Design a protein around this nucleic acid. Sequence first.
DNA 1: CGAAACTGTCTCGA
DNA 2: GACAGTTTCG
DNA 3: CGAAACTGTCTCGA
DNA 4: GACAGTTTCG
Lengths: 149, 149
Amino acid sequence: TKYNKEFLLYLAGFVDGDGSIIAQIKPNQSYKFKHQLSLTFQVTQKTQRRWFLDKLVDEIGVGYVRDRGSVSDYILSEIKPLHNFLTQLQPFLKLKQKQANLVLKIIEQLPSAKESPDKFLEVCTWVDQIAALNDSKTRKTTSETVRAV
Amino acid sequence: TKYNKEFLLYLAGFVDGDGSIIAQIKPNQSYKFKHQLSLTFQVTQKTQRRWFLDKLVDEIGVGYVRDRGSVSDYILSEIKPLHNFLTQLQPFLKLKQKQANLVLKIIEQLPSAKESPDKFLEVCTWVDQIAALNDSKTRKTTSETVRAV
DNA sequence: CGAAACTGTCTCGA
DNA sequence: GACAGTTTCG
DNA sequence: CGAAACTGTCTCGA
DNA sequence: GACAGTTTCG
Ligand SMILES: [Ca+2]
Ligand SMILES: [Ca+2]
Ligand SMILES: [Ca+2]
């Protein structure tokens, strides 16, 4: 699905302000290298304005709204739809464009990263770069912690 | 000056996210009715990203960046430039469009409001409406304060 | 006096 | 805003 | 095992 | 984010 340009321009601005482009390395035993690579695009907002987030679900056509008390979040983690959405939002981002590029880069190498432990490690390096660009304050698992395999 | 539409669309999203459209009644004895009507359009951002706010100064062509430690703000209070700017931005706002329109209405009434204590009081009630629309939490001076006066 | 800059800060809403 | 830790399903 | 949902929370950056 | 209070200066 191809999004409206004016919608993407406005959303890019809103994302640069209240959105988050997240890449995580989740320790999980059921996964090959004992870790799951997780990529998330989200937009946070006061629950009293949940209608704005619900609107994103309709406009983007995928994802959902999570409720966490007085705050809610629009969340999109499905890989294929994420790649399609971010590819279209990337040209308009100003503060988080680098993060969007790294996420797209990661997505495009996910298949081949699920083979070589070295390849996976490299991709985890890209995840570190995203965290370094965001205002990260509580990160634990890094490519270093993953190197313990 | 006429701003570029694609810039206005992105900025409208950024503002709805991290900006603020503010109207205030400031008690000050050097003024006619003992209060100054103050209007402000601002965009807040971590000082590390001050370059983004500086760019806004260059783009908008007026206003300035204030520094308050780890946080900084783009600030536009000059009335004429503010009216011109909000007039062009308001069509693209989704969360703060009402506040922008009330500010525009206030500006247009300023000359006239500087005459009738009753008219100045009315304009002050429009200030109250803007505050009600914002996520106001520390407000003190309202139209009621002004009328006691 | 009045337009606008300068400075400070509560309470979240990211 | 930006994570963390855990569970569900084909 | 991998994709994706579900649920909680630190520390600000608005 | 959204105010409050102070000071400058034409
Ligand atoms: Ca922000
Ligand atoms: Ca924000
Ligand atoms: Ca916001």
